[PDB]
DNA sequence: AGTAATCCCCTTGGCGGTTAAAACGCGGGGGACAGCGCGTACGTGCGTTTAAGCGGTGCTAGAGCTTGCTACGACCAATTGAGCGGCCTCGGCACCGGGATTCTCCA
């Protein structure tokens, strides 16, 4: 899947496209946070864990 | 019926500052501590006598155990209001300042 990924992404980030992930487990998301910060793409987070305002801000 | 995400809450950790409490220096005083002399008060030994300890005899109070039952507490279901959790407020206590009284110490 990363690896299909990585090569959607990118297509899509070549292609200008904007893009929302939906992970089933959290520690996915954790382990996705990393492979992004290893590559250029400017990125935001929601789960569960987050609070409020985290949530209000980071959709702004 | 199970296991994981979501979300509340409450505890731990960090950052800044501010200031009040801890650390540091130094003179001197007076309290700790070793030293001395005496004298009285406690340990020792003896002769005295006192009663604690032992072996023995006698009695009856009352500790300890069984029997019998009925009075009193355990248990349950229905009723209700006394007592708890939440919200409000105002008045008691603290906190400050300032002048008055007290206490301390060197003269």
Known sequence: ???KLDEL???LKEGGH???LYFQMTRMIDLMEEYLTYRNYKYCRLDGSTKLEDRRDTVA
């Open 9 to 11: 992404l990118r297509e």
């Open 18 to 20: 904007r893009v929302l």
């Open 1 to 3: 899947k990363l690896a």
